[PDB]
Paper text:
In this study, we report on the identification of a distinct class of sirtuins (SirTMs) found primarily in pathogenic microorganisms and show that these function as protein ADP-ribosyl transferases. Members of this sirtuin class are genetically linked to a specific subclass of macrodomain proteins, which reverse the sirtuin catalyzed ADP-ribosylation. Moreover, we show that in Staphylococcus aureus and Streptococcus pyogenes the sirtuin-mediated ADP-ribosylation is dependent on another posttranslational modification—lipoylation.
To better understand the spatial relationship between ADP-ribosylation and lipoylation attachment sites, we determined the crystal structure of SpyGcvH-L. The structure contains residues 1–110 and is comprised of a barrel-sandwich hybrid formed by two β sheets flanked by short α helices. In comparison with previously solved H-proteins (RMSDs for all Cα atoms ranging from 0.575–1.14 Å), the most striking differences observed in SpyGcvH-L are (1) the position of the β4/β5 loop (residues 38–40), which diverges from the consensus path by ∼6 Å as a consequence of the presence of Arg72 in the β8 strand (a position usually occupied by Val or Ile); and (2) the absence of a C-terminal α helix. Intriguingly, the missing α helix, which is held in place by electrostatic contacts between four conserved residues in the canonical GcvHs, would occlude residues implicated in ADP-ribose attachment in SpyGcvH-L (Glu24 and Asp27). The absence of the steric hindrance imposed by this α helix may be a prerequisite for the GcvH-L/SirTM interaction and thus could account for the high substrate specificity of SirTMs. Mutagenesis showed that the lipoyl-attachment site is Lys56 within the conserved Ex(2)Kx(10)G motif (Fujiwara et al., 1991; Spalding and Prigge, 2009). Only extended exposure revealed slight ADP-ribosylation of E24A, whereas no ADPr incorporation could be detected for D27A. These findings suggest that Asp27 is the likely ADPr attachment side, but further indicates involvement of Glu24 in the ADP-ribosylation mechanism. On the other hand, Glu24 is only present in GcvH-L homologs. Since ADP-ribosylation is a known modification influencing protein function and interactions (Barkauskaite et al., 2013), it is interesting to speculate that the MARylation state of GcvH-L might regulate the availability of the lipoyl moiety for redox reactions. This idea is supported by our finding that the ADPr attachment site is in close structural proximity to the lipoylation site. Strikingly, SirTMs show absolute selectivity for the lipoylated GcvH-L. Altogether, these data show that lipoylated, full-length GcvH-L is required as substrate in the ADP-ribosylation reaction.
Numbering used by the authors: 1 to 112
């Protein structure tokens, strides 16, 4: 199941929630040239996940969900090109567990 929040894609697969870039966010910030993750494994809503420098702005990716970080796309720090891609294996940011079902359900559906 796919949701959108904070211009991020959130996909539920079993107990794991993958948070990725969207084309809308890419278009709004421009080309990413730098990407640095925070080291907090227990996120609250609005906690910083990832700091970006891009051609139109710098910004922070803020978590739309409380949860526990199980995977970060640390490849993007070496190769920020990945986060400008359309490919799901390249443009993901983090995977969370220990997410509240109702809080995910309350997000807007991806597409509309």
């Amino acid at each position: 199941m796919k949701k959108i929040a904070n211009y991020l894609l959130i996909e539920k697969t079993d107990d794991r929630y993958t948070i990725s870039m969207t084309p809308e966010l890419q278009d709004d910030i421009g080309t990413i040239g730098y990407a640095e993750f925070t080291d907090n494994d227990h996120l609250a809503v609005d906690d910083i996940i990832l700091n970006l420098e891009a051609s139109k702005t710098v910004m922070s990716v803020l978590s739309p969900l409380a949860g526990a970080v199980v995977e970060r796309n640390e490849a993007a720090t070496l190769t920020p090109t990945l986060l400008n891609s359309e490919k799901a294996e390249e443009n993901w940011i983090v995977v969370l567990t220990d997410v509240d079902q109702a809080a995910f359900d309350a997000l807007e559906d991806a597409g509309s």
